[PDB]
Amino acid sequence: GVFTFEDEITSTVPPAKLYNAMKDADSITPKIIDDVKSVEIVEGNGGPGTIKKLTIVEDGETKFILHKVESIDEANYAYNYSVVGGVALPPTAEKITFETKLVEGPNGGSIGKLTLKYHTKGDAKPDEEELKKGKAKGEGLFRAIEGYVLANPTQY
């Protein structure tokens, strides 16, 4: 089964810029996140369908996460990707998607929804903590991306 959660948020950065930064996740993430060290394309051209491998060190031990790029709606400032392998997936959970949608803000800010789709195996329901870890993680990347942009205004 699949279980969906939606969270709403705002940013001072206009959505067009956040979106650009969002598309450049491979580049930025290793810089902003201490534990992320690299992102490599395994197969695909960076578009939807692409499979990526993230290398991390956590508590000094190297680990791998596997991502799939789900869709892109540039006109709509939407960037979606799923965690398809690695540390975030318990056996009941087959995948976890993170979707980010941005809309025009009142103050030349961005209005955005973070959607988490938790796909479990069979009738299993999501673990409470995994869900909590996943929400924090989604929100975390968004903030990190926002931070990079504030730090560097003209890059995007």
Taking CB under 5 A as the rule, does residue 86 contact Na ion? no
Taking CB under 5 A as the rule, does residue 147 contact Na ion? no
Taking CB under 5 A as the rule, does residue 30 contact Na ion? yes
What are the φ and ψ backbone dihedral angles of 121, each rounded to 5 degrees? -100, 125
Minimum Å gap between C-beta 148 and Na ion is 12
Residues that bind Na ion (rule: CB under 5 A) add up to a total of: 1
For residue 139, the one-letter residue type is E
Minimum Å gap between C-beta 126 and Na ion is 29
How many CB atoms are located within 10 Å of the residue 73 CB?
A: 12
Helix, strand, coil abundance in the chain, percent, nearest 5: 30, 45, 25
The interface region with Na ion, picked from 24-32, 62-70, 89-97, 135-143 by CB under 5 A, is 24-32
Task: Say how many CA atoms lie within 13 Å of 105 toward its Cβ.
Answer: 21
Residues that bind Na ion (CB under 5 A): 30
